[model samples]
Target chain A: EVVKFMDVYQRSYCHPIETLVDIFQEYPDEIEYIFKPSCVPLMRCGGCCNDEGLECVPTEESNITMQIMRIKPHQGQHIGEMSFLQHNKCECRPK
Target chain B: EVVKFMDVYQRSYCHPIETLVDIFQEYPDEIEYIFKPSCVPLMRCGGCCNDEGLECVPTEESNITMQIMRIKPHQGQHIGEMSFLQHNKCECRPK
Candidate 1:
């Protein structure tokens, strides 16, 4: 049989997320606002690109606006939106 | 042959150059006034990293200043210096 191995830590992949559950795994209480069409999957970079010259980094990217529900410390929930970066591509280079 | 090939245009390599002849091949006329330590070989980037999510880019870098001669078309020669970026290393990702 052909031989191969799994090096998930040194590779790239993508996953779908309609909500913030998978993304905001740290802030459970901050995932309560959904006021948009609501569907976005982000691609993340990985691998041991920490060499002397080569590196694992993003080459192409864009932004995404998320309409979130915020629960304040002294008040109730509010409606708002914020923008952030999304990884459109990744690779190894002087990056 | 054990199925090896040559893709000089698709990989990364380094060539040592004490002067800019290998670098400034088209600028022999501008090659003058070297009043420094006199040794610097710059690494370069190449390959087809024109895909999405991956690129060939720089991850680590620094600067270099060189004391050079000036040959202005409107005046005589003079002493000056300038700085530029050198390719310390390279690789392929969304860059």
Candidate 2:
């Protein structure tokens, strides 16, 4: 299995009124966009690990990309590049 | 080029004291770990489009993975899994 790590900082993108206004088009609830932030949302084969693992694994892959979108309060409007994750090696699959 | 999109919600993980405490160990400065949030941080070619494009593209791939991490206020202490991006079908390369 291949584990990955990444971080992104967005304070600069959130400071300006024009940028913040653009961002709010999607993530209206996000008062601020914490840039260069880290997260751990993994899925395991065993359903007993944690709530995050409760969901079935998507397919096995060496790597996967994660697209980030900013949600607009209106409904389904967003602005930003999509993101994803990638796994080079794999040993188990979600059931 | 393969554009990707993904988001993660982390309110549950950030709700409780124990969980919050555990998280603080990693991201001390992060008063809160915005769960399953969306992001758009891509490294594209062309040194003139935008500042984000200034960085070199990693490689081409069909998919990628992004492990999230939380940093502590101190010099070098973080809590959370490492993260990265994945591209399955990539066409551009970084200079």
Candidate 3:
């Protein structure tokens, strides 16, 4: 049997953002055609531990890559690489 | 090649506390041999992830148990159990 010192809602899961997060927010009317907001918001891990000393955090992750643009004010396209952690699993762990 | 977004010192490691943590702090000259501080502090994970949106956190853990005394003011030995998470590995992941 598992010991329960405190009751914590300790199910950790990952979910993607429903809406398309705009990657461009700085320039008002300047780089729309050159740099479209194509990158989707990465999948995020979150949950409530329901305790004072525990936090919901990721336990497993892997990196996925996407091709982003690099520009010193490019003409059409300049290749840039981007990699980020894709959250796979999560748990309520000690903080 | 791996993409380098920013400079970060991302090495996750664990270490145990060097000193014996006195479990009996509330009672002064009360319970000595009956409730000696036998439980060692669980190994902790810590590191620096020198980035704005990244944090060092544990990625793996396992549960270990110890025999503790349960009492309504016990005599010498009472049977009880305590379990805690022991951190295994760590990494600098997204915050």
Candidate 4:
């Protein structure tokens, strides 16, 4: 039972986001794009444990590249590149 | 029509969470306890604009009090108070 629980828990966290990213990679034009965090870093906090299991940081650059790539086939390649650069310029500097 | 759209927008943000909190306050034992952020604070970003509308900071202390109060009715009053104090002690000191 314990082994079964651990296997299910690990697979639940790993599969959904990995499969979504794979689908986006294959058919970027068809699927709606939204960035979901991959849980790599873990923290010890009871609130996080109960509420969301574990917090993860966004794979921001990879997601941004995916967004740019989706646009590039229709828009000129340089146009998406320019927009990505502009978006980065306006990103909030954390205090 | 312009007035109708603005009214709908304002109420959609304000109503659902406010109703849930009210329900929790009235029948604290009957409902499942989960904290949801009240959208008091708004941010300016196109990403946030489409996805989830706006960001709001958690009403942490108030929600903690609700949790404590629910537990205290069954448990001793002072015990819940002590746990609240202990929980505060372990909160991460923002670096």
Candidate 5:
């Protein structure tokens, strides 16, 4: 018996809904074999606040937001997609 | 006004539920602001089948499997955890 696996990575800014659609195309079988989707956060210290190379500084009124996902494939056929959101003007600094 | 953001990353071979618990600890408020949890697949070539450094080759009886998650926080206060599963004998190779 032979086994196969595939892993995909996709990053975007606030595009979970779109990324999900794209992933389904790669692994059509994923429709049934795919596991539940999980959401997580993403943060960058300097990219969003013009403070590159420095520690993140949180400020009031910051709207910093980002997320990624993980999808599982059965029988080791293919791993789902890893999506990420890009940083923006929103206040996205580490405490 | 000031905004805050926190990002956390956690990786494991197969510890989705556990990772989620750890994340909740960091951001207790996450319970209310947290978004849906999505599960995604993970794959690495050459590490699982004793074929390190080489492209992964799927073999029969391969059980290769892994997953990760991305969580979002409200008001940019805190980003959840990014969990990953460790590689194992499972057949995990990129297509």
Candidate 6:
């Protein structure tokens, strides 16, 4: 028996929605394939206040926000999509 | 040869970053494992002043946003991360 697996996460950034759409199109016989979309909260370091003297403190915001859709192609396929939202503070964005 | 391939795209939401991290930790012998994070753009209709005649128009926004990090453990490992950002308009949000 031979098994075939495809990893579409690699091209998510360049073409997110299209990437998943193409996956389903390719694996039309796969079972219950779903993508779990996440919502991450992040804050920018230098916005406007940093220029003055307010001392720009990193704030919490949504980092990743997307929806997860599910599809079933074959009877043996059984997958599900999970929706998630997480918040945190980070100063890594280029200022 | 017994080939083992894992599909991590299915879990990009529930436990995203962690999921990929775990895959690397589990497959220590795997060569060049990388994840490509994506940012999707979506918008929904449903805001204040829509019932009377305000005409709530859908807006374009980032759908999914996450960072893709890469790592190599095996001598023959080779992987990389692709960052992406896309924008579009939609009306599916419950406001």
Task: Tell me, by DockQ, which candidate is best.
Answer: 2
i-RMS, each model, one decimal: 23.2, 18.6, 14.7, 16.7, 18.9, 19.3
Estimate, for each residue in A1-95, the C-alpha lDDT of model 3 and write its tens digit: 54332211111111221111223432335354433223223444543343436655667777655454444434565655555565677665788
Question: iRMSD (Å) of candidate 4?
Answer: 16.7
Residue A89, model 5, lDDT: 31
Q: Largest lDDT belongs to which candidate?
A: 3
lDDT (Cα, tens digit) per residue for candidate 2, span B6-27 = 2332211111110011222323
Give me the overall lDDT of model 5: 0.28
Angstrom error of the Cα, residue B68, model 6: value is: 33
Q: What TM-score does each model's chain B reach against the true chain B?
A: 0.46, 0.20, 0.49, 0.23, 0.20, 0.20
lDDT of 4 by residue, A43-84 (tens): 111111112233322323222221122223333422121011
List where candidate 5 sits over 4 angstroms from the true fold: A1-37, A44-74, A91-95, B1-95
TM-score of chain A of each: 0.49, 0.22, 0.52, 0.23, 0.21, 0.21
lDDT of 6 by residue, A1-95 (tens): 11111233332112112111223332457555532221111122321221122332344543333333344434343334332222244232333
Q: Which of the two, 4 or 6, has more DockQ?
A: 6
lDDT of 6 at A35: 25
Docking class of 4: incorrect
Question: On a 0 to 1 TM-score scale, where does candidate 6 land against the true structure?
Answer: 0.18
DockQ score for model 1, please? 0.01
- Per-residue CA lDDT of model 4 for B1-95, tens digit only, reads 02132332232221112111122333356444332220011111111111233332232322222122223334443212101100111111212
Residue A40 of model 2, lDDT score: 21
Candidate 1 residue lDDT tens string, B1-95: 11111222112122211112121332345544322212223333322232323544555555555443444545565545545455555555543
TM-score for candidate 5, residues paired by index: 0.18
lDDT by residue for model 5 (B1-95), tens: 11111222221111212111122443346444432222233232221111222233324222322222333443443333343333333342443
For each candidate, give its TM-score against the true structure: 0.30, 0.18, 0.31, 0.18, 0.18, 0.18
Mind giving the per-residue lDDT tens digits that candidate 6 earns over B17-93? 11111223333554545322211122223222212223333455433323333443333332343322223443323
Q: Write down the TM-score for model 3.
A: 0.31
